[PDB]
Amino acid sequence: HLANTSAHDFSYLKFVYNATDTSLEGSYDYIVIGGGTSGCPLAATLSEKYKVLLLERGTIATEYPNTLTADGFAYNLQQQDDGKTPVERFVSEDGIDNVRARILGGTTIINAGVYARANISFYSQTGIEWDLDLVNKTYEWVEDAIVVKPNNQSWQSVIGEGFLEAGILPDNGFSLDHEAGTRLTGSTFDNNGTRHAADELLNKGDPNNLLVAVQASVEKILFSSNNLSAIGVIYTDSDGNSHQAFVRGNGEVIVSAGTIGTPQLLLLSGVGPESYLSSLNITVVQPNPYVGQFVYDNPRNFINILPPNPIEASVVTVLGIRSDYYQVSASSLPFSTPPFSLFPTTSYPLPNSTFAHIVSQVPGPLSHGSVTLNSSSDVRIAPNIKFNYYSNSTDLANCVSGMKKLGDLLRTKALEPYKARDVLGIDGFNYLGVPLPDDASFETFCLDNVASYWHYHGGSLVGKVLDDSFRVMGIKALRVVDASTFPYEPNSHPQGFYLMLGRYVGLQILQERS
Ligand SMILES: Cc1cc2nc3c(=O)[nH]c(=O)nc-3n(C[C@H](O)[C@H](O)[C@H](O)COP(=O)(O)OP(=O)(O)OC[C@H]3O[C@@H](n4cnc5c(N)ncnc54)[C@H](O)[C@@H]3O)c2cc1C
Ligand SMILES: *[C@@H]1O[C@H](CO)[C@@H](O)[C@H](O)[C@H]1NC(C)=O
Ligand SMILES: *[C@@H]1O[C@H](CO)[C@@H](O)[C@H](O)[C@H]1NC(C)=O
Ligand SMILES: *[C@@H]1O[C@H](CO)[C@@H](O)[C@H](O)[C@H]1NC(C)=O
Ligand SMILES: *[C@@H]1O[C@H](CO)[C@@H](O)[C@H](O)[C@H]1NC(C)=O
Ligand SMILES: *[C@@H]1O[C@H](CO)[C@@H](O)[C@H](O)[C@H]1NC(C)=O
Ligand SMILES: *[C@@H]1O[C@H](CO)[C@@H](O)[C@H](O)[C@H]1NC(C)=O
Ligand SMILES: *[C@@H]1O[C@H](CO)[C@@H](O)[C@H](O)[C@H]1NC(C)=O
Ligand SMILES: *[C@@H]1O[C@H](CO)[C@@H](O)[C@H](O)[C@H]1NC(C)=O
Ligand SMILES: CC1(C)OCc2cc(C=O)ccc2O1
């Protein structure tokens, strides 16, 4: 149930149109906002039976060829953000550099390619009445299209031997499942280095029913006057002109604009906390105190070693999983322009030689913050976001445990060949940045050297904004499907879950209607 090596399939471009085209305006059965990780499979799925309009603010990935290879991963983060690029830069109010996607295919067009299924306990933990058999068939539908078993990479094999030696057991071999132990997982880079992404799932939609508008910046959700319902959207094109599209009958608008874009759009449309919106003189359409609340970013903490002999660059494929920390490492060429957000600030030393980035992820996390509007009218102006890293002490204690484990990993035989000096301790490695340092000093290391893992989620939670069917409570014909919906990560690497979730919810909408 896995995909082959092949070129990125752009056949779907035959139904992709510039949002300047006013013939796109009119009535549809479904409008999907955000052509990303969840939105692309969701729109393709709905188009099997119904007329779908998919609206995406970014352009097409062919415009930026470095999004199409493993080799280009760094380039897209190094590229300056001119407002059109696939990578949009931002800084949380915590002061931590970060990025989100602005491109058809969403974050699967810019990410590190790691594919994994949700922790199988995640479903009962949510309390949603999942159709579990359907979930697994949907995973296979995604995997058959874009996931492969990766080939060996020498550094990934080193790191896998070290995880095992350091006691991250058992050895799970090759597996897509999020389970304790060390494993090789799937990748959306194929064995030729070609990137596969959510946009390619548009190829599974019906070309007679699915229309895609790019450089369509959705500014407002439109509602009925009465029985409050969503009825359509306002979006502007790359020239600045405005356009309207509607749903009809028993159809629906679904927001799939991401952790950041979905709460932003809901607020701008008057769905959010009564007090906050009134203070901005935004008319309240549906008061809900949780829109933009419970927004999470799992911490990344890391060390960099500079081996005395060169190592080969590699994409992450080998995972070391415990309940309280998830670990990986990438080996990378040197660079003199930093990939934005790889390190938490722009003033961070640059590597002269090949290096290994060795990393630990805090699960959850338990610390949370919020998304608030910067402009009360302009969707192209980025919202304020704060994550409050390490405000919850359980997160800190887990970073401490993870950092001690990376210490054990640096002490393994597998890693010994990468020390500069053949001494007994780990100060035999050459480090880029702060090395590992008791308890109080690991806490200070965790707090001072944290970065984003880029796996941020929340802001429109099931049980706070949405019901168990992803419907916005109080409003008919409006749903939200993307990473804004859950308060905890489904696994170490969540694109698999959100690719699946797009199609799954699409199938649930088709079922309800039928
Ligand atoms: C650099 C990076 C590396 C990552 N690496 C990995 C990894 O290796 N493995 C992994 O599993 N996960 C990884 N992730 C995380 C994972 O890819 C994301 O969590 C997930 O893809 C986000 O899903 P989404 O649908 O919520 O968002 P997106 O995929 O970003 O979808 C949102 C889309 O909506 C569009 N949009 C937003 N606002 C509007 C609007 N107003 N009008 C129209 N369109 C709009 C956006 O441009 C975007 O295309 C990575 C994340 C980043 C940032
Ligand atoms: C591998 O990638 C190269 C470079 O992008 C491409 O020219 C070639 O056709 C690919 N191989 C296969 C078998 O698709
Ligand atoms: C859409 O058309 C405008 C010209 O009106 C152009 O500047 C823009 O690049 C086009 N976008 C795409 C994705 O073709
Ligand atoms: C779904 O697949 C997982 C493996 O990813 C397996 O553990 C589980 O038993 C399957 N569930 C069902 C309902 O078949
Ligand atoms: C990688 O594992 C492969 C499995 O395809 C096997 O052929 C071989 O033992 C390994 N190859 C290298 C180059 O180490
Ligand atoms: C909202 O409008 C009132 C006038 O109706 C004004 O007094 C108040 O300052 C406005 N607040 C903002 C934030 O625009
Ligand atoms: C999987 O999820 C369950 C329940 O949420 C949790 O107890 C367990 O720690 C998780 N397993 C891993 C390997 O993260
Ligand atoms: C908008 O963003 C700017 C610059 O990022 C920030 O300094 C400012 O406080 C924000 N304004 C509001 C009203 O949130
Ligand atoms: C951390 O989060 C837990 C679980 O959500 C919560 O009960 C607790 O209040 C938080 N602890 C601190 C110290 O903030
Ligand atoms: C774990 C992580 C973040 O994954 C991807 C990655 C890529 C580069 C390329 O420059 C460098 C380091 C790195 O580490």
XYZ file of C-alpha atoms and ligand atoms in Angstrom:
693
model
C 0.000 0.000 0.000
C 2.818 2.448 -0.839
C 3.606 4.793 -3.710
C 6.278 4.452 -6.398
C 9.131 6.684 -7.475
C 7.754 9.117 -10.054
C 7.538 12.751 -11.036
C 5.383 15.147 -9.092
C 1.991 14.780 -10.773
C 0.707 18.221 -11.837
C -2.217 16.916 -13.959
C -4.669 18.739 -11.674
C -3.447 22.092 -13.103
C -6.030 21.599 -15.869
C -8.655 22.757 -13.352
C -6.546 25.393 -11.537
C -7.439 29.033 -12.293
C -6.278 32.533 -11.398
C -8.674 34.155 -8.904
C -8.802 37.203 -11.250
C -11.190 35.056 -13.342
C -14.676 36.323 -12.444
C -16.349 33.303 -14.079
C -15.339 31.407 -10.901
C -17.866 33.491 -8.960
C -21.212 31.815 -8.459
C -22.785 28.985 -6.511
C -21.180 25.700 -5.456
C -22.080 22.777 -3.273
C -18.922 23.157 -1.167
C -16.329 25.881 -0.679
C -13.004 24.833 0.861
C -10.817 27.678 2.201
C -7.137 26.799 2.084
C -5.597 24.400 -0.358
C -3.327 22.778 2.223
C -2.644 19.501 4.012
C -6.281 18.903 4.970
C -7.986 21.108 2.381
C -6.653 19.380 -0.741
C -7.811 15.827 0.165
C -11.054 17.257 1.523
C -11.885 19.090 -1.731
C -10.868 16.142 -3.942
C -13.064 13.848 -1.835
C -16.107 16.113 -1.972
C -15.728 16.507 -5.752
C -16.547 12.800 -6.316
C -20.253 13.744 -5.919
C -20.560 17.567 -5.756
C -19.375 20.880 -7.197
C -16.417 22.140 -5.127
C -14.544 25.439 -5.212
C -11.091 25.320 -3.581
C -9.595 28.730 -2.710
C -5.873 29.115 -1.955
C -4.060 32.410 -1.248
C -0.689 31.167 -2.565
C 0.272 30.281 -6.133
C 1.216 26.877 -7.687
C 4.337 24.970 -6.672
C 5.708 24.963 -10.232
C 6.449 28.663 -9.668
C 9.051 27.677 -7.024
C 10.875 24.532 -8.166
C 12.928 24.183 -5.003
C 9.722 23.011 -3.283
C 9.803 19.861 -5.423
C 13.003 18.127 -4.180
C 14.505 17.068 -0.887
C 17.553 19.141 -1.864
C 15.515 22.326 -1.940
C 14.190 22.088 1.624
C 16.661 24.653 2.987
C 16.391 26.989 -0.025
C 12.717 27.779 0.663
C 13.530 28.760 4.269
C 16.602 30.740 3.147
C 14.601 32.675 0.514
C 13.431 36.148 1.598
C 9.670 36.569 2.189
C 8.390 39.029 -0.435
C 4.693 38.220 0.165
C 4.477 35.769 -2.779
C 6.936 33.091 -1.697
C 5.802 29.623 -0.551
C 7.279 30.289 2.908
C 5.693 33.019 5.003
C 7.944 34.126 7.870
C 6.653 35.104 11.316
C 7.859 35.565 14.908
C 5.755 34.525 17.866
C 5.275 37.068 20.620
C 7.586 34.743 22.605
C 10.363 35.894 20.225
C 10.749 32.554 18.383
C 11.153 32.604 14.588
C 8.713 30.408 12.657
C 7.147 29.787 9.218
C 3.901 28.735 7.568
C 3.078 27.806 3.998
C 1.619 30.103 1.299
C 1.196 27.704 -1.664
C -1.215 25.182 -3.233
C -0.563 22.024 -1.233
C 0.031 24.024 1.921
C 2.683 22.953 4.360
C 3.258 19.574 2.654
C 5.007 21.571 -0.096
C 7.610 23.014 2.319
C 7.983 20.436 5.103
C 10.635 17.867 5.979
C 8.663 14.952 4.477
C 8.334 12.713 7.562
C 5.240 10.513 7.352
C 3.668 8.742 10.334
C 0.183 7.579 11.344
C -1.525 8.754 14.532
C -0.758 6.986 17.805
C -3.554 4.360 17.813
C -4.631 5.458 21.311
C -5.272 8.975 20.043
C -8.776 8.158 18.779
C -10.304 6.939 22.045
C -8.494 9.754 23.891
C -10.439 12.311 21.799
C -13.840 10.765 22.569
C -14.962 11.248 18.956
C -16.961 8.325 17.551
C -14.412 7.606 14.852
C -15.112 5.049 12.133
C -11.806 3.323 12.788
C -11.891 0.991 9.790
C -12.579 4.000 7.523
C -9.663 5.858 9.148
C -7.296 3.055 8.154
C -8.612 2.815 4.581
C -8.123 6.593 4.279
C -4.511 6.316 5.506
C -3.914 3.731 2.741
C -5.473 6.048 0.149
C -2.998 8.787 1.095
C -0.016 6.423 1.435
C -0.733 4.688 -1.883
C -0.497 8.100 -3.539
C 2.419 9.925 -1.898
C 4.260 7.872 0.780
C 7.280 5.587 0.183
C 9.607 3.350 2.134
C 12.853 5.383 2.174
C 16.222 3.998 1.134
C 19.176 3.771 3.514
C 20.949 6.983 4.427
C 24.177 6.555 6.347
C 23.538 9.243 8.986
C 19.971 8.074 9.642
C 21.347 4.567 10.169
C 23.977 5.886 12.582
C 21.303 7.731 14.555
C 19.064 4.649 14.577
C 21.860 2.518 15.989
C 22.468 5.182 18.632
C 18.827 5.468 19.684
C 18.826 1.683 20.205
C 22.134 1.688 22.091
C 20.827 4.548 24.239
C 17.833 2.425 25.257
C 15.048 3.716 22.998
C 13.630 0.226 22.513
C 12.342 -1.849 20.934
C 13.653 -1.949 17.380
C 10.503 -1.577 15.279
C 12.136 -1.975 11.861
C 10.184 -0.187 9.136
C 6.777 1.001 10.315
C 4.422 3.927 9.755
C 2.969 3.629 13.271
C 3.735 5.941 16.176
C 4.987 3.440 18.778
C 7.613 3.423 21.502
C 11.029 2.415 20.204
C 13.242 3.214 17.237
C 12.073 2.867 13.662
C 12.351 3.807 10.022
C 9.100 5.588 9.074
C 7.583 6.700 5.775
C 8.518 9.758 3.729
C 6.784 12.005 1.206
C 10.121 12.467 -0.554
C 10.460 9.462 -2.844
C 13.692 7.471 -3.318
C 14.692 9.776 -6.201
C 14.379 12.846 -3.915
C 11.193 14.123 -5.625
C 8.717 15.704 -3.219
C 5.136 14.452 -3.178
C 2.496 16.534 -1.451
C -1.167 17.165 -0.720
C -1.626 18.979 -4.037
C -1.224 15.633 -5.822
C -4.314 14.312 -4.036
C -6.229 16.878 -6.142
C -5.544 14.395 -8.955
C -7.994 12.049 -7.237
C -10.854 14.541 -7.580
C -13.352 14.527 -10.412
C -12.115 17.030 -13.054
C -15.731 17.893 -13.946
C -16.682 18.899 -10.418
C -13.571 20.459 -8.816
C -12.328 23.982 -9.507
C -9.234 25.497 -7.865
C -8.596 29.245 -7.579
C -5.043 30.297 -6.659
C -3.865 33.635 -5.335
C -7.377 33.819 -3.851
C -7.111 35.520 -0.464
C -10.319 34.783 1.481
C -11.203 37.862 3.556
C -14.632 37.132 5.020
C -17.137 34.332 5.538
C -20.649 35.434 4.552
C -23.713 34.551 6.642
C -27.498 34.516 6.279
C -29.637 37.315 7.746
C -32.340 35.223 9.545
C -31.240 30.051 11.719
C -27.673 31.330 11.321
C -25.894 29.758 8.339
C -22.704 30.312 6.407
C -23.597 31.035 2.795
C -20.351 32.027 1.060
C -17.103 33.976 1.114
C -15.425 37.174 -0.045
C -11.962 36.760 -1.583
C -9.663 39.172 -3.407
C -7.296 38.401 -6.265
C -3.645 39.305 -6.853
C -4.716 42.640 -8.456
C -6.725 43.592 -5.385
C -10.222 43.194 -6.859
C -12.978 41.494 -4.913
C -15.076 38.388 -5.724
C -17.929 36.432 -4.138
C -18.789 32.729 -4.133
C -21.660 30.951 -2.431
C -22.845 27.525 -1.425
C -26.363 26.305 -2.175
C -28.896 23.834 -0.843
C -27.447 21.488 1.747
C -23.851 22.453 0.925
C -21.204 23.852 3.246
C -18.212 26.134 3.668
C -15.216 24.424 5.276
C -12.288 26.410 6.686
C -8.940 24.648 6.134
C -6.669 27.677 6.509
C -4.402 26.244 9.228
C -3.666 26.876 12.885
C -2.998 30.523 12.048
C -5.353 31.290 9.126
C -8.526 29.589 10.385
C -8.937 31.519 13.693
C -7.868 34.698 11.869
C -10.674 34.324 9.300
C -13.275 33.308 11.915
C -12.475 36.437 13.961
C -12.561 38.735 10.927
C -15.996 37.264 10.124
C -17.336 37.994 13.631
C -17.029 34.457 15.096
C -15.142 34.739 18.376
C -15.142 36.150 21.898
C -17.892 38.729 22.337
C -15.732 41.046 24.461
C -12.703 40.918 22.145
C -14.697 41.472 18.950
C -16.801 44.298 20.411
C -13.648 46.078 21.579
C -12.491 46.002 17.946
C -15.927 47.134 16.712
C -16.305 43.890 14.778
C -19.962 42.861 14.665
C -20.462 39.572 16.508
C -22.184 36.971 14.350
C -21.598 34.032 16.713
C -20.054 34.628 20.167
C -17.629 31.882 21.193
C -14.941 32.564 23.826
C -12.495 29.993 22.393
C -11.822 31.116 18.804
C -8.087 31.799 18.747
C -7.611 30.215 22.174
C -5.694 27.041 23.007
C -2.989 27.474 20.378
C 0.017 25.174 20.828
C 3.597 24.792 19.518
C 5.598 21.711 20.545
C 9.119 22.832 21.591
C 12.169 21.787 19.592
C 15.388 21.552 21.617
C 18.613 20.576 19.963
C 22.376 20.272 19.779
C 24.622 20.532 16.690
C 27.797 18.504 16.311
C 30.484 19.224 13.708
C 32.221 15.918 12.903
C 35.882 16.118 11.894
C 35.181 14.202 8.656
C 32.320 15.173 6.330
C 28.962 13.436 6.635
C 26.307 13.082 3.928
C 23.191 15.220 4.068
C 20.047 13.211 4.785
C 16.328 13.694 5.216
C 14.818 12.571 8.535
C 13.500 9.003 8.363
C 14.547 7.343 11.662
C 12.521 8.179 14.785
C 13.263 7.527 18.454
C 9.973 7.539 20.353
C 9.198 7.606 24.081
C 5.981 8.760 25.726
C 7.663 11.911 27.000
C 9.977 12.855 24.096
C 10.312 12.234 20.356
C 13.784 12.494 18.835
C 15.329 12.665 15.349
C 18.424 14.056 13.667
C 19.231 15.530 10.270
C 22.661 15.926 8.714
C 23.060 18.977 6.533
C 25.535 20.818 4.329
C 26.905 24.110 5.669
C 25.367 27.439 4.714
C 26.113 31.156 5.000
C 22.472 32.264 4.649
C 20.504 30.701 7.549
C 17.239 28.859 6.860
C 14.788 31.055 8.760
C 13.410 29.409 11.959
C 15.813 26.443 11.841
C 17.423 28.335 14.702
C 15.179 30.517 16.879
C 16.738 33.860 15.888
C 18.710 35.365 13.039
C 21.735 36.000 15.285
C 22.904 32.391 15.618
C 26.328 31.104 14.516
C 26.602 29.664 11.038
C 28.209 26.271 10.312
C 31.396 26.174 8.219
C 31.204 22.403 7.620
C 28.698 19.549 7.551
C 26.759 19.208 10.778
C 24.219 16.972 12.454
C 21.166 18.631 14.030
C 20.108 16.307 16.896
C 16.669 17.090 18.189
C 14.045 16.320 20.860
C 10.316 17.203 20.774
C 8.183 17.803 23.883
C 4.815 16.020 23.417
C 1.525 17.824 23.922
C 2.455 20.339 24.709
C 0.597 21.427 27.817
C 1.602 25.087 27.514
C -0.698 27.109 25.288
C -1.251 30.621 23.991
C -3.523 32.345 21.490
C -4.012 33.970 18.076
C -5.303 37.582 17.938
C -5.916 39.960 15.054
C -3.321 42.541 14.080
C -5.540 44.201 11.476
C -9.279 44.057 12.082
C -9.955 44.177 8.320
C -6.978 42.936 6.262
C -6.431 39.166 6.018
C -3.004 39.593 4.329
C -1.615 41.172 7.516
C -0.433 38.377 9.788
C -2.150 37.866 13.167
C -0.298 38.036 16.465
C 0.473 34.615 17.892
C 1.912 33.553 21.235
C 2.735 30.027 22.378
C 3.994 30.614 25.972
C 6.669 27.908 25.639
C 7.414 26.216 28.979
C 4.760 28.101 30.943
C 3.569 24.676 32.118
C 6.201 22.914 34.247
C 5.314 19.422 32.989
C 6.587 20.497 29.543
C 9.876 21.642 31.097
C 10.298 18.368 33.001
C 9.804 16.478 29.732
C 12.402 18.621 27.938
C 14.794 17.825 30.789
C 14.209 14.085 30.291
C 14.651 14.433 26.518
C 17.881 16.428 26.878
C 19.354 13.796 29.232
C 18.462 11.194 26.596
C 20.342 13.099 23.886
C 23.242 13.022 26.365
C 23.020 9.232 26.402
C 22.892 9.274 22.601
C 26.092 11.321 22.409
C 27.732 8.664 24.626
C 27.031 5.671 22.340
C 29.614 3.814 20.271
C 27.526 4.580 17.165
C 28.325 8.290 17.615
C 31.945 7.937 18.817
C 33.357 8.176 15.238
C 31.974 11.726 14.994
C 33.936 13.224 17.898
C 36.786 15.628 17.138
C 38.846 14.419 20.147
C 39.049 10.753 21.218
C 38.382 11.622 24.857
C 36.088 9.864 27.308
C 33.389 12.549 27.628
C 31.004 14.291 25.259
C 33.121 17.444 25.291
C 35.083 15.451 22.689
C 32.522 16.645 20.104
C 32.775 20.008 18.370
C 29.493 21.874 18.805
C 27.761 24.590 16.835
C 25.848 26.664 19.370
C 25.300 25.759 23.005
C 26.326 22.228 24.073
C 24.518 20.179 26.685
C 25.546 21.330 30.202
C 21.906 18.174 38.339
C 18.522 19.582 37.175
C 18.609 23.380 37.248
C 21.068 23.685 34.360
C 19.028 21.459 32.044
C 16.011 23.638 32.836
C 17.994 26.737 31.860
C 19.248 25.021 28.715
C 15.673 24.101 27.801
C 14.299 27.597 28.395
C 17.096 29.576 26.715
C 17.649 27.487 23.591
C 14.140 26.469 22.517
C 12.985 26.609 18.886
C 9.724 25.686 17.156
C 9.247 22.148 15.921
C 6.846 23.712 13.347
C 4.088 21.321 14.493
C 1.815 24.056 15.895
C -1.902 23.301 16.251
C -5.104 24.503 17.923
C -7.062 27.728 18.016
C -10.356 26.146 16.838
C -10.658 23.087 19.075
C -13.130 20.244 18.810
C -15.130 20.592 22.039
C -14.516 24.387 22.252
C -15.336 25.806 18.806
C -16.391 22.608 16.994
C -18.577 19.601 17.729
C -17.519 15.986 17.107
C -18.365 16.418 13.401
C -16.096 19.466 12.990
C -19.129 21.789 12.739
C -18.761 25.289 14.160
C -21.213 25.252 17.058
C -24.187 27.560 16.599
C -23.689 27.964 12.844
C -25.109 25.819 10.048
C -23.140 24.935 6.926
C -19.715 25.855 8.402
C -16.931 23.399 9.296
C -13.224 23.523 10.087
C -10.746 20.787 9.101
C -6.973 21.279 9.550
C -4.482 21.410 12.433
C -6.438 24.085 14.348
C -8.759 21.354 15.606
C -6.888 19.313 18.239
C -5.093 20.449 21.411
C -2.415 17.704 21.377
C -0.255 16.211 18.659
C -1.536 12.886 17.255
C 2.092 11.652 16.947
C 5.584 13.079 16.461
C 4.883 14.083 12.832
C 1.295 15.073 12.108
C 1.012 15.612 8.312
C -0.094 11.981 7.944
C -2.964 12.531 10.388
C -4.106 15.777 8.756
C -3.865 14.425 5.193
C -6.051 11.533 6.369
C -8.416 13.856 8.249
C -9.159 15.903 5.124
C -10.524 12.884 3.237
C -12.136 11.344 6.333
C -14.269 14.381 7.121
C -15.110 14.720 3.435
C -16.428 11.149 3.532
C -18.442 11.915 6.693
C -20.048 14.914 4.936
C -20.891 12.764 1.923
C -22.384 10.106 4.239
C -24.493 12.506 6.309
C -25.922 14.095 3.187
C -26.754 10.794 1.514
C 8.960 23.878 8.034
C 7.986 22.810 8.456
C 8.367 21.493 8.443
C 7.480 20.468 8.812
N 7.907 19.173 8.706
C 7.042 18.236 8.979
C 7.425 16.896 8.832
O 8.518 16.564 8.423
N 6.491 15.936 9.095
C 5.257 16.246 9.522
O 4.504 15.327 9.733
N 4.868 17.493 9.734
C 5.702 18.463 9.447
N 5.313 19.777 9.589
C 3.962 20.105 10.078
C 2.837 19.777 9.129
O 3.304 19.834 7.795
C 1.710 20.772 9.400
O 1.381 20.718 10.774
C 0.441 20.543 8.586
O 0.826 20.284 7.240
C -0.485 21.735 8.613
O -1.775 21.333 8.086
P -2.909 22.428 7.821
O -3.859 21.891 6.813
O -3.444 22.847 9.139
O -2.087 23.647 7.199
P -1.556 24.048 5.749
O -1.025 22.843 5.071
O -0.645 25.204 5.900
O -2.902 24.504 5.027
C -3.374 25.858 5.158
C -3.463 26.476 3.788
O -4.440 27.544 3.800
C -3.932 28.645 3.092
N -4.603 29.824 3.579
C -4.436 30.426 4.789
N -5.208 31.473 4.940
C -5.917 31.564 3.754
C -6.893 32.465 3.292
N -7.349 33.490 4.001
N -7.388 32.260 2.050
C -6.934 31.217 1.346
N -6.020 30.312 1.675
C -5.550 30.545 2.906
C -2.431 28.601 3.336
O -1.695 29.321 2.375
C -2.166 27.097 3.253
O -1.911 26.659 1.928
C 6.183 20.806 9.242
C 5.828 22.159 9.313
C 6.681 23.150 8.885
C 6.246 24.591 8.949
C 14.686 11.485 -10.728
O 14.834 12.915 -10.635
C 15.457 13.483 -11.795
C 15.765 14.929 -11.482
O 14.605 15.619 -11.041
C 14.528 13.297 -12.990
O 15.100 13.890 -14.151
C 14.298 11.808 -13.221
O 13.370 11.619 -14.287
C 13.789 11.127 -11.938
N 13.712 9.682 -12.115
C 12.558 9.002 -12.203
C 12.683 7.516 -12.382
O 11.463 9.560 -12.140
C -3.130 36.265 -12.116
O -3.225 37.383 -13.029
C -2.420 38.528 -12.691
C -2.643 39.561 -13.775
O -3.958 40.098 -13.717
C -0.949 38.137 -12.564
O -0.212 39.263 -12.112
C -0.779 36.991 -11.578
O 0.583 36.574 -11.540
C -1.659 35.817 -11.991
N -1.516 34.711 -11.058
C -1.342 33.446 -11.460
C -1.210 32.422 -10.371
O -1.295 33.141 -12.654
C -5.670 0.370 11.984
O -4.318 0.179 11.643
C -3.459 0.125 12.787
C -2.039 0.121 12.270
O -1.677 1.418 11.816
C -3.808 -1.109 13.608
O -2.999 -1.142 14.776
C -5.276 -1.083 14.012
O -5.614 -2.329 14.611
C -6.176 -0.842 12.801
N -7.549 -0.632 13.237
C -8.613 -1.220 12.685
C -9.946 -0.845 13.272
O -8.509 -2.017 11.763
C 20.553 -0.988 2.783
O 19.631 -1.873 3.064
C 19.375 -2.409 1.768
C 17.929 -2.818 1.692
O 17.426 -2.417 0.424
C 20.384 -3.510 1.490
O 20.489 -3.708 0.082
C 21.763 -3.157 2.052
O 22.112 -4.064 3.093
C 21.914 -1.687 2.563
N 22.669 -0.884 1.609
C 23.702 -0.091 1.931
C 24.290 0.710 0.808
O 24.158 -0.042 3.072
C -15.638 51.760 18.317
O -16.613 52.718 17.878
C -16.963 53.704 18.864
C -17.990 54.613 18.227
O -19.173 53.910 17.878
C -15.716 54.458 19.344
O -16.060 55.337 20.412
C -14.628 53.485 19.781
O -13.436 54.205 20.059
C -14.362 52.478 18.673
N -13.300 51.567 19.058
C -12.422 51.071 18.188
C -11.375 50.163 18.766
O -12.463 51.347 16.984
C 0.032 7.188 22.741
O -1.094 7.831 23.352
C -1.407 7.331 24.658
C -2.726 7.949 25.074
O -2.837 9.319 24.715
C -0.263 7.649 25.611
O -0.529 7.055 26.882
C 1.068 7.137 25.067
O 2.114 7.745 25.817
C 1.292 7.455 23.572
N 2.389 6.650 23.064
C 3.506 7.163 22.541
C 4.537 6.168 22.097
O 3.676 8.378 22.428
C 0.795 44.196 14.748
O 2.127 43.675 14.452
C 3.155 44.581 14.854
C 4.446 44.189 14.176
O 4.584 42.779 14.138
C 3.184 44.532 16.365
O 4.329 45.195 16.885
C 1.918 45.233 16.822
O 1.840 45.261 18.242
C 0.667 44.544 16.264
N -0.504 45.384 16.462
C -1.637 44.942 17.020
C -2.752 45.936 17.124
O -1.752 43.797 17.426
C -0.234 22.229 33.225
O -1.261 21.635 32.499
C -2.008 20.744 33.320
C -2.758 19.799 32.413
O -3.450 20.498 31.392
C -2.894 21.617 34.177
O -3.760 20.804 34.957
C -2.021 22.456 35.097
O -2.809 23.496 35.668
C -0.818 23.111 34.382
N 0.239 23.380 35.348
C 0.807 24.577 35.526
C 1.888 24.637 36.564
O 0.464 25.565 34.879
C 15.203 17.991 12.503
C 15.551 18.940 11.357
C 14.793 20.171 11.706
O 14.879 18.435 10.325
C 15.127 19.018 9.036
C 16.464 19.797 9.102
C 16.938 20.383 7.770
C 18.078 21.029 7.731
C 18.580 21.664 6.441
O 19.294 22.692 6.569
C 18.887 21.212 8.975
C 18.486 20.644 10.153
C 17.169 19.882 10.184
O 16.735 19.286 11.435
